[PDB]
């Protein structure tokens, strides 16, 4: 639930 996390799959 990190607002700065990458929102793509498995990168």
């Amino acid at each position, epitope marked *: 639930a990190n607002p*700065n996390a990458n929102p*793509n*799959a498995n990168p």
Partner: antibody
Amino acid sequence: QVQLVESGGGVVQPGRSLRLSCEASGFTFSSYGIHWVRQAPGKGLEWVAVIWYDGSNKYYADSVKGRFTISRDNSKNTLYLQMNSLRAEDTAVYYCARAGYSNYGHYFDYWGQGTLVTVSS
Amino acid sequence: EIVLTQSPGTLSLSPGERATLSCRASQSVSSSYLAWYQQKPGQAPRLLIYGASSRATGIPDRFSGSGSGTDFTLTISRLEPEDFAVYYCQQYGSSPPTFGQGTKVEIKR
């Protein structure tokens, strides 16, 4: 040929609502998160919202928090941005941008043409 | 919230000259996560540099990125006629991604 096509822009009265669309193609839409970035007339760029690749998480900017709602539909390769209770400072060109390769962070590697939202009476 | 300051405001150079743009952050950008964008009037921004130094796909070699911590630099070795536009720097090391005010490189005559 990664292209993002915006639609839904137009004139909207202050306080009313407007729904934007972003139809994607040229890449696997369900494997990438998509942003919304706006640019006020004569001003700079400002990040608005983001949605995960699977639509699980949706984070916004403090300027639009509680008023804008980002959603997607991976079957139709389409992104949405429901804008409610629009204000004068919301007048801008809205781009939908694809998320970039990173371990943690939001940068925009491919943009769209952008659609103009004019909040005026 | 990190604020990005770009200098100079407007850069007046001639084609073939060397261009250097500065981006100054109020806080240290983690992992040197700074991007650079090009934007011409009426057109959308496009990505040039990501990760402060890695070059985006389809970007010429004259574009170069460097810097870390709080000071960054975009460098165009030999300015081409299609390189005159507004350049924005963006950091993605904090919860809200933030842009600079933009540096404009202008044709000198």
